[PDB]
Amino acid sequence: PSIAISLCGGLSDHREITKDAFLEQAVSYQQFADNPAIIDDPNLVVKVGNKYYNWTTAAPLLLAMQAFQKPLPKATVESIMRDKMP
Amino acid sequence: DLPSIAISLCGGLSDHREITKDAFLEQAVSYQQFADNPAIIDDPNLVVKVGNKYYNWTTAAPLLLAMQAFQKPLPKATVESIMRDKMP
Ligand SMILES: [Cl-]
Ligand SMILES: [Cl-]
Ligand SMILES: [Cl-]
Ligand SMILES: [Cl-]
Ligand SMILES: [Cl-]
Ligand SMILES: [Cl-]
Ligand SMILES: [Cl-]
Ligand SMILES: [Cl-]
Ligand SMILES: [Cl-]
Ligand SMILES: [Cl-]
Ligand SMILES: [Cl-]
Ligand SMILES: [Zn+2]
Ligand SMILES: [Zn+2]
Ligand SMILES: [Zn+2]
Ligand SMILES: [Zn+2]
Ligand SMILES: [Zn+2]
Ligand SMILES: [Zn+2]
Ligand SMILES: [Zn+2]
Ligand SMILES: [Zn+2]
């Protein structure tokens, strides 16, 4: 899946993330390299495919894809979102 | 192109013990183990191997995000600074 990060926010207010708002505050590589603490920003949104996650939800999804070269099961993702999404 | 990642619950980084190949692999986390317990990511004993080096989760997290989101690892000088801030 395509993956990107942005500081648009809106997840904790359960706001729908629009492509336009996401892109207006997308984080570039150099920007993240200059300030890696961005990973802890409350407004950080992670785009994974068509969905938008907070970092706490995206982290296991992402860790699994790189460590095992395949996504987690569908039932696992549902459980992570249930546990971790705002 | 991206470096390989493995995870283990061998621990030892925060006591500054040397991470041995045997200790890492004997307690390596498998796909089904992580799929059954994704909270392992918060386990205090989690060690993340990135290429040749061993990190705790707090250090590995930005490395992992940069690789996935930008499809390239962070610069080496950046990783060194993350280590100073986040390694135990
Ligand atoms: Cl912000
Ligand atoms: Cl379903
Ligand atoms: Cl279902
Ligand atoms: Cl979870
Ligand atoms: Cl949980
Ligand atoms: Cl240990
Ligand atoms: Cl534990
Ligand atoms: Cl445990
Ligand atoms: Cl443990
Ligand atoms: Cl120390
Ligand atoms: Cl210490
Ligand atoms: Zn902020
Ligand atoms: Zn389902
Ligand atoms: Zn959980
Ligand atoms: Zn100890
Ligand atoms: Zn444990
Ligand atoms: Zn250096
Ligand atoms: Zn820092
Ligand atoms: Zn220490």
Numbering used by the authors:
A (entry chain B): 463 to 548
B (entry chain A): 461 to 548
The authors write:
We, therefore, truncated the M-Lip domain of mouse lipin 1 to remove the C-terminal cluster of hydrophobic and basic residues implicated in membrane binding by HDX-MS. We refer to this construct as the M-Lipxtal domain. Phases were obtained using single-wavelength anomalous diffraction from selenomethionine (SeMet)-derivatized protein. The M-Lip domain of mouse lipin 1 and lipin 2 formed a symmetric or near symmetric dimer in all three crystal forms with a root mean square deviation for all atoms ranging between 0.36–0.77 Å. Analysis of the dimer interface of the M-Lip revealed an extensive network of interactions between the two subunits with residues within the α3 helix, which was located in the center of the dimer, mediating the majority of these interactions. SEC-MALS reported a MW of 25.6 ± 0.6 kDa for the mouse lipin 1 M-Lipxtal domain, which was consistent with the MW of 26 kDa for a M-Lipxtal dimer.
Lipins are magnesium-dependent phosphatidic acid phosphatases (PAPs) that catalyze the dephosphorylation of the membrane lipid phosphatidic acid (PA) to produce diacylglycerol (DAG). Phospholipid synthesis and fat storage as triglycerides are regulated by lipin phosphatidic acid phosphatases (PAPs), whose enzymatic PAP function requires association with cellular membranes.
